Amino acid sequence: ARPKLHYPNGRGRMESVRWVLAAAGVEFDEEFLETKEQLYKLQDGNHLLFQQVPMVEIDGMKLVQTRSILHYIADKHNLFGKNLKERTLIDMYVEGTLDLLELLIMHPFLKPDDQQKEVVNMAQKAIIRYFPVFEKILRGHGQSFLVGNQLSLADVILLQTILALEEKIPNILSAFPFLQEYTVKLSNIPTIKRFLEPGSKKKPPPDEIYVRTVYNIFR
């Protein structure tokens, strides 16, 4: 076995799956979509449940839907808590955080005028809607993890999203010292630290070639 990820060569929606696999210590392969014809081939052969990517071949199955993929991996590698109470919290936090990450996922495809507007919208949402929640959680119970004092899917997705946000707004954590310190400790967990170093399968911020490619593939 060994997971194989099907996506174009870039972050998009697949980046959360890369984060969670790397964080769990799971090495993986990628089969990159570069052309519209490669997508059609993948759709032609019944490999994509709903004709879309992300898709991951894992444990003899061909999983689709970003959130389902994440839930499966988390459950295989103790990243979804120890009971229903913790699972529920992790789930809500992840779903919330994915609504913020969505703004970064769509950013590359907005007109330039709207791209600037969207960075402002990102800043407002992070600072007013999301970060205070996680900041308060971390200030209140003091721990290095949001839930159950062990690494969970909520920590991994929050880290991805924070780090992605900081690329657009370098000082975004300045009013959030507990989140600053959280980000640093999380970033030192051996698997995460390696994922963040050169040579991992972590994808860079999207360049003009990725944007043209996705337009070419998905129109």
Ligand X SMILES: CCCCC[C@@H](O)[C@H](CCO)SC[C@H](NC(=O)CC[C@H](N)C(=O)O)C(=O)NCC(=O)O
91 touches a copy of itself (CB under 8 A)? yes
For residue 218, the partner it binds in ligand X, a copy of itself, none, with Cβ less than 5 to 8 A by kind, is ligand X
Segment near ligand X (CB under 6 A); pick from 50-58, 81-89, 118-126, 174-182: 50-58
Quote the least distance from Cβ 74 to a copy of itself, whole Å: 11
Quote the least distance from Cβ 197 to a copy of itself, whole Å: 32
- Please provide the DSSP assignment of 115-146 as one string: HHHHHHHHHHIIIIIIHHHHHHHHHHH--SSS
Q: Which residues make Cβ contacts (< 8 Å) with residue 44, sequence separation at least 6? A: none
Q: Give the chain's radius of gyration (CA, Å).
A: 17
Q: Which residues make Cβ contacts (< 8 Å) with residue 94, sequence separation at least 6? A: 67, 70, 153, 154, 157
65's tokens:
């839907």
Site for a copy of itself in 37-56 (CB under 8 A): 49-51
5 touches ligand X (CB under 6 A)? no
Helix ranges (DSSP H) in the chain: 15-23, 36-44, 66-76, 84-106, 112-124, 131-141, 153-168, 177-187, 190-196, 208-218
Binding mask 88-107 for ligand X (x = CB under 6 A): -----------x-----x--
199 touches a copy of itself (CB under 8 A)? no
Site for a copy of itself in 129-188 (CB under 8 A): 129-130, 133
Quote the least distance from Cβ 196 to a copy of itself, whole Å: 27
Q: Which residues make Cβ contacts (< 8 Å) with residue 12, sequence separation at least 6? A: 54, 105, 206, 214
| Near ligand X by CB under 6 A: residue from 17, 19, 21, 54 | 54
Contact 4, 69 (CB under 8 A): no
Contact 120, 114 (CB under 8 A): no
- Residues at the interface with a copy of itself (CB under 8 A): 49-51, 61, 63-65, 67-68, 71-72, 75, 84, 88, 91-92, 95-96, 99, 128-130, 133
Q: Binding-site residues, please?
A: 7, 52-53, 65-66, 210
Binding site for ligand X (CB under 6 A): 12-13, 51-54, 65-66, 99, 105, 109, 214, 218
